[model samples]
Target: SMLGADVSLGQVVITKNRNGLYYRCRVIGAASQTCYEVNFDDGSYSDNLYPESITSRDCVQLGPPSEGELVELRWTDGNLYKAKFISSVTSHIYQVEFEDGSQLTVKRGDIFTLEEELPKRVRSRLSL
Candidate 1:
């Protein structure tokens, strides 16, 4: 029931997994009962998934950061760096440039806005 009669190839969608995690996927082919053959954003493939388990890509759980916006990037080395958003290569991947002039394409989950970093105390508070 997730797919409508108009569902077509190359359409992006968000699919809910059994664990309740939503993933971005693309429609590669159509199947019975509004199901679809899809490729997940993470490079996984599904031969068939019910339409009921899918949603339009606009319904994605988390939206990508805005271009030119400031964000805090969490690196693998356990350090957080200030970064500025450049652009999105995909729904889940973004290109960001750090203070040092180097750029990296990072996952959306790895980046956060200044407000989002407050709870973690990763960035110092600003005074009025």
Candidate 2:
């Protein structure tokens, strides 16, 4: 049913809920728009999920931003800015320190895994 959705077996993904900010889940079985048997990074299990609730692992990698890991936050210009992960607040709230020495709390969707090699005042951005 989801030929266009390439959430194949054993693939890692992000589930919208628990139910935290997001969970790094694995596609344990071929199942669901329909139904997916998802296994969270926390070793939790869930089912009865529609495809819309699942985001590709790389597309929007959301898990507890590993403490002390390098991540990005949605900056003022609406671009993802590099930030150092301080820790996750309640697993739903993310606390990060920006380059400006300012700290902020961001949601799951707002946090992104740093992919590109953007450097110095570049504002690692996206194309309009």
Candidate 3:
């Protein structure tokens, strides 16, 4: 799910198992060639899969939501913009509606997740 330059240490990398790529591994180091020493789920070290074409896509990062407010942003082709408070949250999870009418169910942790590392557009609408 990533190009050849995405593999790095401490990054969570996913690999294909029997039922899709549900297993996550912490990248320890890049061994010789393209193999990486990753700790598997069973606490074992394996180098069967190289850092090539894996079905591992990085996790999405969302910005911190306002207190009891639903955070809405327009996402087109994975690029996000127009972030604003859309509604008030009445439950544990906030329902975020995008411009395309697609909705994303986000929890409290997701609302407060770190999003500055994401490749999204964050323009200052007002200097307030």
Candidate 4:
């Protein structure tokens, strides 16, 4: 229990990255001390995570652009690409399919609309 609440085994929760983007994960088991074993919704697993790093998925709030809406996503490569929001995988995570036909599970915070401009560096690279 890290957030002043106990997260039961098999409960879906939110885990954040250094960039502050949240991800969907589940409590698989309890580890020693205040740590817990977690399995991300995208199928990744880890055996050592402090409960302080976990939060209830519902605690995150998302606005506009429902499922099936078109959006732009910031990929791991630091490039923003055209994508479509397929569906919500968790409270703060969504499954998006890129124009290139590749799909990824991303947090809502990582998605952007066409009205918003992509980062200057990423835009410059796309021009190359």
Candidate 5:
């Protein structure tokens, strides 16, 4: 039998679009390639697939920055944005990849606050 790090499989991450409420999520499993499964926080939830980019090798799984943690991000706008985590990491990093193949990552550091509104296209897609 193989043994692995017995870490806390759960986290309550707060995102920008789904409002400021903390989402109850858990790490269901990690793929052979290191991709992760973040099950919804609510017990009634069924959807459990999460993308890979959110899980950074540098970050402790689901751990947020403290009083003075620095983060480096490369934006799709051909620019770099750097900031410290004053409070916590937003749930949704907003790493949006447009249809044209460009991408961007938005955080609370960039917005200063979160708006409960999601992109029209994203909302529409999720609804369907």
Candidate 6:
């Protein structure tokens, strides 16, 4: 009659990737030593992830973006990349295209607008 973490197989959850961004992941297996195994939408899997890094789907922020607005697309690897909002699909789901013609459908949690101007690449004063 001991209560423990309630996660199960094949349920959708979020995970903190190596890049520090939260990405949607599915529970692939039961807990082991206080960690859970998850598979990202893009077919990547990780083992021994802390329960703190996995969570529910209650963090959909920065949604309903302006059409054609430059946005940051959070890839399956949980890293943000420069992209543009194409259109809203039915409702929450959206389509965006990367610079290289890579188009993808995403949820509110995946698309984001920059808080300020995007930082430009910096170069050292001394020429290489």
- Model 6: C-alpha RMSD to truth? 22.4
Query: What's the C-alpha lDDT at position 86 in model 6?
Result: 39
The superposed Cα distance between candidate 5 and the true structure at residue 73, in angstroms, equals 1.6
* Clash numbers, per candidate: 2, 1, 0, 0, 3, 0
What lDDT, from 0 to 1, does candidate 2 have? 0.37
Backbone clashes, candidate 5: 3
| Candidate 3, residue 117: lDDT | 40
Candidates 1 and 6 compared: the better one by lDDT is 1
- lDDT (10s digit) by residue, model 6, range 22-108: 444544334223233444444554453333332232113433445555444444567644443334322233344433333444444
Put down candidate 4 lDDT per residue, 1-128, tens digits, no spaces: 23332334455444333334433444444422322344444455445433333222211243323545545443345654444333332223344443334345544455443345666543443311
Query: Who wins the TM-score comparison?
Result: 4
Backbone clashes in candidate 6 total 0
- Could you estimate the TM-score for every candidate? 0.25, 0.22, 0.19, 0.27, 0.22, 0.23
Residues 1-128, model 2: lDDT tens digits = 33443334444443333113333444444422333333444344444323234323221244443445544344334544344444322223344443234444444444344343433323323211
Q: Rank the candidates by lDDT, best first.
A: 4, 1, 6, 2, 5, 3
Q: Write the per-residue lDDT of candidate 3 for residues 55-77, one digit (tens) a residue.
A: 23211333223433322332323
Candidate 6: residue 14 lDDT (0-100): 42
lDDT measured at residue 114 in model 3 versus the true structure, 0 to 100 = 25
> lDDT of all the models against the reference?
0.39, 0.37, 0.31, 0.40, 0.32, 0.38
Candidate number of the best lDDT: 4
lDDT of 5 at 124: 43
Clashing pairs in 2: 32-35
- CA shift at 124, candidate 2, in angstroms? 55
* Candidate 2 vs 4: which has more lDDT: 4
Report each candidate's C-alpha RMSD, comma-separated, in the order given.
Answer: 22.5, 22.3, 25.1, 21.8, 17.5, 22.4
